[PDB]
Structure 1
Amino acid sequence: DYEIQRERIELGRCIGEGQFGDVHQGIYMSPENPALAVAIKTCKNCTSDSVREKFLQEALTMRQFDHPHIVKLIGVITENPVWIIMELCTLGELRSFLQVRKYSLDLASLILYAYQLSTALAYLESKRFVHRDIAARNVLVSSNDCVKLGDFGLPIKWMAPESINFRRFTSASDVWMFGVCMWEILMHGVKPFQGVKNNDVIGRIENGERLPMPPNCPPTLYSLMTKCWAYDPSRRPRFTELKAQLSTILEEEKAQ
């Protein structure tokens, strides 16, 4: 089962702050693997069952997916203090990694990350799961050549127009938000619309404006991004198709 005995967990260095509390790395001592490196999400306010409810929904949902580019649940400890134990991605959240690895990562690698992300989102799409919070900050880096979707759950600057005007969230909103994430990656983790009032962002989308083509970004990728940003959700592509196009973009980039 998925409940874990606190005695098999050795808490270690704090590796990040989450919505609910500190995120730690640590060791999980099971009989199947005597020393498994894990991540531990903690829940600062989980004495409140309303918080505990929302915190542990993340683990109930993780548990349903099996993809190579989606983080995996190990187990939970539900007595206080409540903990989620999940796979460790030792290079942390994608945004910081992009920031710190600027000048160090090449183009093929940035494309590799977007294509990897699209395969995770095509998989979720095939399961009819809407994610609603696709952003570089919600992706983790397992290795120089492997990123993973780390969260499932306001980010106006990332959201589709119909999310903002009708609070509506669909596979097509996800596609839109994934265009923004691709932009974020080709900009090495610069946030979209920096220094722009949220409320002014919506008018500019309605005005037809869009995020600029990043430097060093290929026309083929920018064209992909702009299809993701069709104002009408029914003109935007499906991740299955985005996945296939990014596969071609990557094979050709590898060729230089």
Structure 2
Amino acid sequence: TYIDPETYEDPNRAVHQFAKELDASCIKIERVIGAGEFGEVCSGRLKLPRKRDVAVAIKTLKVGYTEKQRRDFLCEASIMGQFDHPNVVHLEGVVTRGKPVMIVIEFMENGALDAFLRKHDGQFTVIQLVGMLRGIAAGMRYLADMGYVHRDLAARNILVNSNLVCKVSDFGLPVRWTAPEAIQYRKFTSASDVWSYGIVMWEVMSYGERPYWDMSNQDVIKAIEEGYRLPAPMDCPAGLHQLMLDCWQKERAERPKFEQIVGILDKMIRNPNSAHH
């Protein structure tokens, strides 16, 4: 059920096809909470026909844009808007023509996962962490069987809410996240995403540590070709590191599938101590 919008003769028919246009009147900007690649990402609320008010985040497109940057920008909203699943950020709608140009997404109060973990270092138990990864897996099983390949899967592109529910984000357009076949031959697949997931798995348990630390990309690739793989972060159960290695199998077939993953991680939250097998 996933159509690409860059398979479109108009890119701004995809936008309106999958995204609900919103009235700016109904949108409140309150704070800044980052700079997106296109325009200040702000936090705020949106007013629906009587539902208290939704807490939303607001990607802006700054003015004096190329009619292109607008297309690029909104090709995020055209994609994100086609997915409905708990562990994939909910689109609320867009502001295309008429008013300041905006993608109104659901508010994740905790921000990107890499940052949220670096700040809460050691504060989370191994069930809770397995639970956070469990969500992203759920996220990607959905996207996967929707026919979508993320390409840029990383802990900075997962977002966390008040309830520590992680959801997949960044739907637009990163060597140490990318699989060998994808780096070398652009063979981006839901297998290459599982590799990236593996790296996310390490990022989580490490609590937001940079993959491969300060190894150059050059070093990281040679490292991987020699068969180097990352080790069990402090306190990470061995079986859980093992899953990381499966995700990092060189033969992309041999990796587990996102459904297989969700499966394994569930056992571990079910019987934790088995996570050392």
- TM (normalized to structure 1)? 0.95
> What is the SS of the residue equivalent to 1:113?
helix
Is residue 218 from structure 1 mapped to residue 237 from structure 2 by the alignment? Answer: yes
Q: Contact (CA 8 Å) 1:43, 1:82: kept in 2 or not? A: yes
- CA displacement, residues 2-60 of structure 1 (integer Å, 9 cap, x when unaligned): 11111111111111222222211112122242522111011236621111111001111
Q: Which residue of 1 aligns with 2:118?
A: 99
Q: Contact (CA 8 Å) 1:163, 1:169: kept in 2 or not? A: yes
Q: Contact (CA 8 Å) 1:8, 1:29: kept in 2 or not? A: yes
- CA displacement, residues 120-175 of structure 1 (integer Å, 9 cap, x when unaligned): 11111111111111100001111343111122249001110011110220011011
Cα RMSD of the aligned pairs, angstroms, is 1.8
Q: Which residue of 2 aligns with 1:67?
A: 85
Report deviation, 1:101.
0.8
**Residue range with higher mean Cα deviation, 204-213 or 24-33:** 24-33
**Paired residue type of 1:62:** M
> What is the SS of the residue equivalent to 1:84?
strand
Identity %: 41
Structure 1 unaligned spans of 5+ = none
The 5 Å alignment of 1:29-48 reads: 29-44=47-62, 47-48=65-66
Distance 1:46 1:146, change over 3 A: farther
Q: Matches of 2:171 and 2:201 in 1, distance apart?
A: 18
Distance 1:154 1:49, change over 3 A: closer
Q: Contact (CA 8 Å) 2:122, 2:207: kept in 1 or not? A: no
After superposing on structure 2, the runs of 4+ consecutive aligned residues of structure 1 that deviate more than 4 Å are: none
Q: Matches of 2:63 and 2:231 in 1, distance apart?
A: 41
Q: Matches of 2:108 and 2:115 in 1, distance apart?
A: 13
Q: Matches of 1:46 and 1:33 in 2, distance apart?
A: 35
Q: Matches of 2:109 and 2:85 in 1, distance apart?
A: 18
**Residue range with higher mean Cα deviation, 143-152 or 97-106:** 143-152
**Paired residue type of 2:189:** T
> What is the SS of the residue equivalent to 1:125?
helix
Structure 2 unaligned spans of 5+ = 1-18
- CA displacement, residues 151-209 of structure 1 (integer Å, 9 cap, x when unaligned): 22490011100111102200110110000000000000011012111122111111100
Q: Which residue of 1 aligns with 2:26?
A: 8
Q: Which residue of 2 aligns with 1:18?
A: 36
- TM (normalized to structure 2)? 0.88
**Paired residue type of 1:106:** T
Q: Contact (CA 8 Å) 2:72, 2:173: kept in 1 or not? A: no
Aligned pairs, number: 256
